[PDB]
RNA sequence: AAAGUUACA
RNA sequence: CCAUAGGUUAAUGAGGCGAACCGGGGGAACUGAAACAUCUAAGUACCCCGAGGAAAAGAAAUCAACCGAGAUUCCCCCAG
RNA sequence: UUUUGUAUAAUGGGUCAGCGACUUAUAUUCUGUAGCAAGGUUAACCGAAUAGGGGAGCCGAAGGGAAACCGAGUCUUAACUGGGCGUUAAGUUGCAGGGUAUAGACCCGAAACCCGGUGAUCUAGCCAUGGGCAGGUUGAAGGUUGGGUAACACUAACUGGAGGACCGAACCGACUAAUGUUGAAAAAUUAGCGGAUGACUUGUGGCUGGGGGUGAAAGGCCAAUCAAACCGGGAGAUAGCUGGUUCUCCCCGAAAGCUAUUUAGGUAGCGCCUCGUGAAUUCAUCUCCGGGGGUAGAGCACUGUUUCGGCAAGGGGGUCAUCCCGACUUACCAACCCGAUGCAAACUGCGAAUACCGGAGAAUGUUAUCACGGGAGACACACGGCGGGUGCUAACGUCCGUC
RNA sequence: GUUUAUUAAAAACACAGCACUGUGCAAACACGAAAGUGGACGUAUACGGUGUGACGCCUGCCCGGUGCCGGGAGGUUAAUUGAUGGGGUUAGCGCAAGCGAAGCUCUUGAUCGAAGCCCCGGUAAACGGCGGCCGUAACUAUAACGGUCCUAAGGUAGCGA
RNA sequence: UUGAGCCUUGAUGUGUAGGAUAGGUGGGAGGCUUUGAAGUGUGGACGCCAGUCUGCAUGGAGCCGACCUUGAAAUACCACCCUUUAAUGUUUGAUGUUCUAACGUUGACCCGUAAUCCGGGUUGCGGACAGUGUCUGGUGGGUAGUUUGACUGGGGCGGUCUCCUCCUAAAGAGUAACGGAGGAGCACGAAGGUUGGCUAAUCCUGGUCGGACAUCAGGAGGUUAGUGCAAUGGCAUAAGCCAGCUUGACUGCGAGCGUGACGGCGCGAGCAGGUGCGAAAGCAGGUCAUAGUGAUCCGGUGGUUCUGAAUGGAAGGGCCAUC
RNA sequence: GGGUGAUUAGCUCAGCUGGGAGAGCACCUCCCUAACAAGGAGGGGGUCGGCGGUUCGAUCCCGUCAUCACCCACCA
């Protein structure tokens, strides 16, 4: 069984001397499915950037087999805002389109005999060969089939005027149109809804080539992965099994490491007590034991686990009238997202906003924050309400600035409502508890980017929160910390998310989008929402179709 | 399940 | 009945000793390195086996450089 | 002899006579001398063999560059106005001598390491075999006969003769003292002392052998030797350590410092010594001239420390609305400004004498100066004067500078 | 009883007794390149090693450390095997460049890979270990008692200048 | 019993539009089935739930193309086929059980032989285990060879060991002590280069929250400030502070010096080539200076046909830059 | 004589090359109770040993002294 990829002694060093990856020796075999786990900063995206060939700085040797295609989807897929849907899409088939245009230019040869045959007719064969390498002529059908299978927006739509989920779908389609042999995915379900994620995971299970996927979720991982690469601090640990068994193994590993560190502390204290005694005569003391103690005094890497410190500052006191919408309606062109929506938000409530992609979830936040003007108006907030909004996109932070400068603005004392707070203490409240204040925004990882985003955008101190997909790149630990912080909140919050479990653990009012632009509002949590649906239900259970890619 | 004590004419 | 091992009798040799030299089987350490462990001393001292008047080697599956020389051994250079 | 320094009460020598320590291979550099000279010279070897042949070679006349390569030039560099190394000075082979290298390498001297053998006639254990233990005590089990008991159990007397049992000779030891310590004796004698039928003692003969044995275990014993026997060899181990180093005269004449050191008592480069060669009013002294100081002394503008006055903010405890504006007390702690007065290695708005650096001028001085080359020794210093650190303004203390 | 022949005869060694442990016999163990011997012409009521040391009353708590015993799941892991990638050479395609078949080579090293170690239990007549500070009762004299920190556990019986 | 691979035989391929599950080109015409059907009843499998594939039963001659309005055409073969899958083979690999014939036997019997040695022969029992050889991981004071620094008011213990600043240090340099005080093992693509511009600390007076001290205004003062970090020396022409443009934090050299015992270290005008700033004169080969460090060996990386053990390459060397 | 460590609320102790400074029980009030204990609710405390120092911060960093706790004083 010839492998597909190999890494031997692969090591990476980041600023100062930090071995994110140390001695990672691995082989990737045909038909494999690997899920890469770890905390927010472990080095998963680093390892995939190495596997994509983008990073060659590493120590060791990492290489794929020759003439195998690696399709790399990062966790920051960039697209051309000028481009429309088709203008961004065809770049994945640009060879065929460019060659076809060249054929159109060449066809004037047989009209005008200028440099007739010995100069370009021979190259016409090379052009027809590059068409033949693909289907080429039946290309519009390929594009239509891909768009149908991935539920892409119509090609006339622009890219800036696109929802985050559909943006990720465009990136997925442009990646998979290349038709590679090894997929590298960096959180491929970042902004996807339930149907999109289910289709993607079925496709991944069907994929013939190798798949290496980074995921902070567990159910999609149980679906797709064949084995897990833990990727702890420094070292990568393979594992055969499911997420819960791997979790058990991980707790056992961390408990053993904690016990060994405690024993090390014990032995070091004992030997220090020995070192701090006198010679007692003209006898040994001994340099061998001194050397043993000096080498025993070493350094161990503590886990940079976020855990429960996510600091949501308390806003101003909130009256009973918080938010009210009456007959809200919004449409774009001919497709309408919200139609005759009315609801009131009692104080203290967490509102789980759910629905498919581009259904209007983010545009609702735009109206509430006042950046968009509804057709049917009647959005209102109580006079005590102070709004703090967290966007679906992090594209507002200066990647040059450091963490502390970007969060705090450079002022040593930070004002949060009534109380002045030390900026360094406030930043450290968001797990940047060391010299992590010095890291650059661009050099931060995706999960650290989300944490810094929350830190910068919760400082306004509003007692109404408008969080749009707040747990995008976060792992389970930061997710739990955020859930606890949201629970210990005096004000009220509206959270848009696609994590059903995270939304269920905190939501008190469900705002769910449906077809034909109806936004059903339900006061209650997800358990009683499901119970209400069961009480007044409809008889069927089959959502998907799982269309195809090939042919 | 827990439930101790509290000087006399 | 086999046959072999074994036994018996003959003839034929060799045993042991000896100074060095010679071929082989094993093979130190002190010392030097200003310590020492790679390294050196040194394949030396020593032990053992086997010859001979010498012994070993010896007649290219050797060198050399498109010219060539022609088995082995020893001496002087090459060259510290 | 060793030392800073010895009559030293530090070492060595009783004395005589004899012996006793810088040698010999090669190789290399320098000096003298001899021969030839841009040449000199052969080695092995042949040889009627100190000749004569033999020129294989070696050194020299050309260097530069890592090299290719170029060449009285070359290298560097894109190139050098450049710069480094060379060109404008004879070598070579003997002989004698001074060094160095390898050999024991000036002589003597370890404790040790390795190799091969000799030892269990001493002593450790064990094995086979066969001897020794005067004399006297105590009385175990068991047994018998009676009492007993249903039978036992038990009990008495008699018996019996156990025991790493008791006392004590031979025998085996070795606790105490004295003597003896160039002894009667390289461990004993004398007077006492312990065991003395046992894990005893003893004869003869065996067996275990050196990182091995044996050990009722002390590192004990293994031929008067044992934390690794003895004999022979490697072997003249090695010894930065000690000792010793032998005839005479003449000339010059040190150092005990710096730097480095697995280095401090060793060594290396430099300083200082000597010999040779070559060179300049080269060097030294004094006079004059041109310089830089930040020392002694002094001073208090600076950094600090100080006293005393005069102005005096502020600061600490009471008299009050023991919140405000503070409204009033210091026989005041107190730097800030001024007037006086001190102190300072790490203070300076000042500042010598000397010393040092350079120039000129004589006189004087066996060139005293510098460079190169051969040979060293020395790198433990001592005290005294002057300037100081340290110490106690101690030390024949210790550490620097200078004489 | 033994011991430092030759300054130590003792409280030292031994000892009967005790315990732990190994050992199923071609025993463990020891001497020995080996053969083979002892153990033993014995056979777990036997033999070896270790500690303690008649007898009497006893021998408390700690398995965290070191060792030993058991476990096998997972991790790390040797020699082996030599996939894969890279390079050297060159028949040719080019005779300007450069590429490069087959072979042969240099290197790199996928896959396979046991015991140990990590890990999980046990074991102290295995080697070993067996706490602080503060307050508190008719005098502060002391604390039966209490608070708290730490530990693997905090020294029990009995002895004690 | 399995694991893996390979060859066959099957089975399988729901987009939209389309008659309805359409893999790809085919390449061709009609074949299929009658060697018994286009079906009904029945059983399993797949099932993107439409459905097409299937073992059967009497009945056994009709299903699609061809026709085209779809990007494409009609399981209407064998294909070498792609995708998944399942079966018999095939190799191999693992584990297990049985066997005997290697091997063991310190079981019995027989012979050599008048011998509990040894050998041979029968037989029993184990048995490809055990055991040994080579290679290899672990353990291994059982044994062996060694190491285990120096200074030091004796040694040990404590402290120190390299570099920078001041004093000791005696007005040139240098100058010791286990003398007296402190620091370094870096920082900076600006905090470097230039060209312009600018001048502090502290105090007094007036001024909204606002005072002992924030920002403002004017007066004294005159560097008591500042310098990336110790101390010393220096700095107004600022070496201090601000801004524009920038990369001289250049490459090859280098008269001449200073300082070292040397290794080495430092300063440097000027020359050549290119550059930045400035209108120019000019300045710039790092930073106000003095700390911020490590010889050689060995090896790594890039460049250079300098070398290349017959020749052409190459390996390995050298040179340059660097780790 | 030399060396080391500790100092944090009333007590015993945790405390990030910074971030009012924390835990048990003590203390305060209120419930519960005839009344106390125990139990339950609320609450407050601080020289971070002290003058010192590179610092965006000194509790943890920064020489020192103050005290109590140790350790060593060997050949001699
Ligand atoms: N140049 C850099 N210098 C210093 N730290 C860096 C640099 N680049 C990245 N890092 C750090 O390396 C860490 C690893 O980041 P990385 O993106 O690999 O993590 P991740 O686990 O893959 O993230 P995520 O799951 O959130 O996408 C982060 O903490 C990041 O800040
Ligand atoms: N300016 C616009 N013109 C046209 N269409 C627009 C415009 N802005 C947004 N849309 C579209 O309208 C829909 C609204 O989507 P929106 O960004 O509000 O979030 P969502 O789709 O509800 O959520 P999510 O961000 O999670 O996908 C999307 O389909 C989006 O592409
Ligand atoms: Mg040796
Ligand atoms: Mg030596
Ligand atoms: Mg030695
Ligand atoms: Mg022959
Ligand atoms: Mg006398
Ligand atoms: Mg004398
Ligand atoms: Mg001569
Ligand atoms: Mg003998
Ligand atoms: Mg007597
Ligand atoms: Mg005898
Ligand atoms: Mg011997
Ligand atoms: Mg001898
Ligand atoms: Mg020798
Ligand atoms: Mg004289
Ligand atoms: Mg010396
Ligand atoms: Mg002196
Ligand atoms: Mg244990
Ligand atoms: Mg085990
Ligand atoms: Mg040893
Ligand atoms: Mg200027
Ligand atoms: Mg220039
Ligand atoms: Mg210009
Ligand atoms: Mg080369
Ligand atoms: Na990532
Ligand atoms: Na959106």
């Amino acid at each position: 069984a010839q492998f597909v990829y190999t890494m031997h002694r692969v090591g990476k060093v980041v600023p100062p001397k930090r071995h994110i990856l140390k001695n990672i020796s691995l082989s990737f075999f045909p038909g494999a499915k690997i899920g890469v786990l770890g905390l927010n900063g472990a080095g998963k995206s680093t390892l995939l950037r190495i596997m994509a060939g983008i990073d060659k700085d590493i120590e060791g040797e990492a290489r794929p087999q020759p003439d195998i295609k690696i399709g790399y989807l990062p966790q920051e897929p960039q697209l051309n805002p000028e481009h429309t849907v088709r203008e961004s899409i065809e770049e994945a088939v640009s060879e065929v389109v460019n060659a076809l245009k060249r054929l159109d230019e060449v066809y004037a040869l047989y009209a005008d005999p200028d440099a007739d045959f010995d100069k370009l007719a021979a190259e016409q064969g090379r052009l027809e060969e590059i068409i033949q390498a693909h289907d080429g002529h039946n290309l519009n059908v390929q594009l239509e089939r891909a768009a149908d299978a991935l539920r892409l927006p119509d090609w006339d739509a622009k890219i800036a005027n696109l929802s985050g989920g559909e943006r990720r779908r465009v990136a997925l389609c442009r990646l998979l149109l290349e038709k590679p042999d090894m997929l590298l995915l960096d959180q491929p379900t970042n902004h996807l809804d339930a149907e999109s994620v289910a289709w993607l995971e079925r496709f991944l299970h069907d994929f013939e080539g190798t798949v290496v996927a980074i995921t902070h979720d567990r159910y999609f991982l149980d679906n797709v992965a064949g084995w897990i690469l833990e990727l702890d601090r420094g070292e990568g640990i393979p594992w055969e099994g499911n997420y819960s068994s791997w979790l058990e193994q991980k707790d056992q590993r961390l408990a053993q490491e904690a016990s060994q560190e405690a024993a090390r502390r014990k032995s070091i204290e004992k030997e220090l007590e020995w070192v701090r005694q006198g010679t007692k005569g003209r006898q040994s003391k001994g340099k061998a034991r001194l050397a043993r103690f000096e080498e025993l005094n070493s350094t161990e890497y503590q886990k940079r686990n976020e855990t429960n410190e996510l600091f949501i500052p308390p806003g101003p006191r909130l009256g009973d009238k918080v938010l009210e919408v009456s007959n809200l309606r919004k449409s774009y062109g001919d497709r309408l997202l919200i139609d005759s929506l009315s609801f009131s938000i009692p104080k203290g409530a967490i509102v789980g906003i759910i629905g498919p992609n581009g259904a209007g979830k983010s545009t609702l936040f735009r109206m509430i924050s006042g950046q968009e003007q509804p057709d049917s108006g009647t959005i209102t907030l109580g006079e005590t309400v102070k709004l703090a909004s967290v966007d679906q996109f992090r594209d507002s932070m200066d990647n040059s600035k450091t963490v502390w400068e970007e969060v705090s603005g450079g002022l040593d004392i930070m004002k949060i409502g009534n109380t002045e707070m030390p900026s360094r203490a406030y930043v450290g409240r968001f797990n940047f508890k060391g010299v992590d204040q010095g890291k650059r925004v661009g050099e931060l990882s995706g999960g650290e980017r989300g944490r810094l985003h929350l830190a910068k955008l919760l400082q306004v101190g509003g007692n109404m929160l408008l969080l749009d997909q707040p747990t995008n790149d976060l792992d389970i630990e930061t997710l739990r910390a955020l859930e606890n912080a949201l629970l210990e909140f005096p004000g009220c919050a509206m959270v848009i998310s696609h994590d059903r479990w995270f939304l269920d653990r905190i939501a008190t009012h469900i705002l769910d989008y449906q077809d034909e632009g109806k936004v059903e509002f339900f006061e209650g949590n997800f358990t009683e929402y499901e119970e209400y649906k069961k009480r007044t239900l409809g008889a069927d259970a089959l959502e998907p179709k799982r269309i195809k890619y090939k042919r």
Side-chain angles (χ1 to χ4, degrees), chain A residues 1-125 127-128 130-334 336-551:
Chain A
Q2 269 79 349
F3 59 66
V4 175
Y5 201 89
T6 183
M7 340 192 79
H8 191 75
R9 256 69 156 279
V10 152
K12 178 109 196 75
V13 187
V14 278
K17 298 284 132 264
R18 175 185 154 183
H19 268 250
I20 277 188
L21 313 183
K22 51 160 300 188
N23 204 102
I24 287 190
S25 283
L26 277 182
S27 294
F28 294 77
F29 289 88
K33 276 117 186 54
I34 308 101
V36 187
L37 289 187
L39 294 191
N40 272 314
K44 295 164 264 124
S45 18
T46 316
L47 178 102
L48 257 69
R49 259 191 297 279
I50 301 153
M51 272 192 111
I54 310 171
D55 206 332
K56 190 92 178 232
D57 158 88
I58 59 107
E59 185 226 20
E61 157 262 295
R63 42 164 258 259
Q65 285 288 150
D67 213 304
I68 95 108
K69 212 45 57 207
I70 280 166
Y72 172 61
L73 181 100
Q75 67 165 327
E76 64 269 349
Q78 78 302 36
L79 295 172
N80 199 267
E82 290 70 62
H83 285 30
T84 89
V85 165
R86 201 175 188 86
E87 283 201 19
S88 76
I89 271 289
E90 78 314 316
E91 301 217 79
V93 278
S94 103
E95 302 85 1
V96 146
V97 198
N98 291 332
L100 280 173
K101 299 164 116 272
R102 197 61 22 100
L103 277 274
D104 273 3
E105 309 148 37
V106 150
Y107 263 28
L109 145 68
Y110 310 113
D112 40 71
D114 187 30
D116 203 313
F117 277 122
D118 301 340
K119 307 180 208 159
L120 86 164
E123 182 262 4
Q124 196 224 10
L127 292 172
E128 263 168 339
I130 198 137
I131 310 288
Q132 183 39 107
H134 332 103
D135 178 323
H137 293 312
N138 268 313
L139 189 273
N140 38 311
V141 44
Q142 290 177 228
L143 299 197
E144 169 274 282
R145 198 217 186 78
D148 196 60
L150 274 78
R151 303 210 320 285
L152 301 183
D154 13 12
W155 326 82
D156 335 296
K158 306 213 102 80
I159 250 45
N161 291 321
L162 225 69
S163 44
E166 290 164 341
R167 222 146 168 266
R168 288 295 264 84
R169 291 212 285 247
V170 153
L172 235 32
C173 220
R174 95 195 282 96
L175 170 89
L176 296 175
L177 278 207
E178 322 266 50
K179 298 172 277 189
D181 321 62
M182 172 148 47
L183 276 166
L184 310 178
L185 311 169
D186 208 348
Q187 286 183 212
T189 66
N190 225 330
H191 301 68
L192 282 187
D193 40 304
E195 40 286 17
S196 279
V197 153
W199 174 91
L200 169 88
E201 76 196 347
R202 162 78 183 279
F203 153 83
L204 288 186
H205 170 272
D206 195 19
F207 193 48
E208 53 271 26
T210 300
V211 168
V212 190
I214 299 167
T215 141
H216 282 123
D217 108 289
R218 101 218 296 274
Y219 309 93
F220 166 76
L221 211 159
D222 280 60
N223 233 95
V224 297
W227 57 279
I228 290 160
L229 174 74
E230 205 257 301
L231 202 37
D232 206 358
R233 38 203 153 98
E235 301 267 35
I237 297 113
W239 180 254
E240 255 82 25
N242 65 83
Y243 188 87
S244 188
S245 92
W246 165 88
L247 201 50
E248 259 161 323
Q249 161 252 1
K250 198 246 280 173
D251 321 275
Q252 294 168 31
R253 206 189 71 235
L254 297 195
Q256 285 169 17
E257 276 193 85
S259 190
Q260 287 155 15
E261 192 53 42
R264 171 138 70 257
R265 300 289 265 276
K266 200 82 42 184
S267 78
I268 282 164
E269 208 160 272
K270 162 245 190 63
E271 282 278 272
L272 196 43
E273 142 166 347
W274 172 85
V275 167
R276 299 223 205 89
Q277 284 185 322
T279 174
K280 200 146 176 165
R282 328 185 272 172
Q283 267 217 311
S284 17
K285 202 60 186 315
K287 282 191 305 176
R289 206 162 164 187
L290 259 281
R292 256 187 266 117
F293 172 68
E294 267 43 74
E295 62 87 21
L296 182 55
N297 285 43
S298 166
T299 0
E300 72 107 44
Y301 262 128
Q302 211 198 75
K303 238 186 172 214
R304 201 62 36 233
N305 213 331
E306 300 76 277
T307 75
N308 277 241
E309 44 241 43
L310 261 72
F311 176 54
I312 311 194
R317 165 214 100 83
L318 210 47
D320 44 15
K321 221 202 61 51
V322 164
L323 174 97
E324 59 220 28
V325 317
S326 163
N327 324 107
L328 163 64
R329 159 146 171 159
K330 173 73 158 196
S331 321
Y332 276 121
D334 254 331
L336 109 159
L337 331 174
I338 292 156
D339 175 279
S340 65
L341 166 66
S342 306
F343 70 92
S344 312
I345 294 308
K347 101 170 175 185
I350 270 47
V351 184
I353 306 179
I354 74 171
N357 265 337
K361 301 189 292 298
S362 317
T363 246
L364 176 63
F365 273 15
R366 295 232 276 279
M367 317 255 189
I368 300 174
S369 195
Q371 313 311 63
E372 277 225 7
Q373 292 301 323
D375 329 349
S376 297
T378 54
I379 253 119
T380 5
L381 309 139
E383 92 160 335
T384 69
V385 172
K386 203 200 174 316
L387 241 183
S389 187
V390 160
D391 310 34
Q392 193 176 128
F393 302 96
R394 286 88 187 265
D395 270 6
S396 185
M397 23 201 69
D398 184 16
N399 302 325
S400 78
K401 290 181 188 58
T402 105
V403 175
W404 173 92
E405 307 194 359
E406 185 72 282
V407 167
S408 51
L411 305 322
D412 277 339
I413 319 275
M414 261 205 48
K415 202 203 69 154
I416 302 148
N418 267 232
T419 299
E420 332 284 310
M421 197 144 156
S423 131
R424 295 184 68 100
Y426 173 77
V427 173
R429 277 213 181 269
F430 283 89
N431 205 55
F432 304 100
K433 282 275 310 299
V435 75
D436 322 325
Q437 260 88 10
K439 318 170 100 153
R440 319 302 275 206
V441 171
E443 309 299 87
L444 281 190
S445 72
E448 281 170 331
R449 179 166 311 262
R451 233 191 299 141
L452 170 131
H453 185 76
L454 273 176
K456 179 173 151 46
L457 265 57
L458 288 185
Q459 89 214 310
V460 352
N463 44 27
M464 164 85 114
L465 290 182
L466 254 60
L467 306 197
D468 201 356
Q469 279 206 3
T471 39
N472 244 328
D473 300 293
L474 306 196
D475 49 314
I476 165 62
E477 325 322 345
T478 319
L479 212 177
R480 186 217 344 280
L482 176 91
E483 146 175 327
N484 294 330
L486 261 156
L487 279 180
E488 302 99 62
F489 194 53
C492 58
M494 318 203 37
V495 170
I496 310 171
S497 195
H498 287 117
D499 197 320
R500 203 52 45 104
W501 289 264
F502 157 66
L503 279 167
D504 160 88
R505 277 185 299 241
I506 58 169
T508 89
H509 292 63
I510 269 68
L511 192 62
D512 115 83
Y513 284 58
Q514 287 152 0
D515 74 319
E516 196 79 320
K518 56 179 306 175
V519 185
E520 153 83 349
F521 180 56
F522 174 92
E523 310 193 33
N525 59 50
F526 277 90
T527 312
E528 31 203 29
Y529 187 68
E530 191 266 282
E531 284 205 8
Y532 158 63
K533 262 198 320 289
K534 155 142 208 53
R535 217 168 318 144
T536 40
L537 87 175
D540 71 335
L542 243 185
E543 265 288 345
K545 183 174 144 45
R546 186 39 192 69
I547 292 194
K548 217 169 183 179
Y549 271 134
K550 61 171 89 210
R551 216 245 67 87

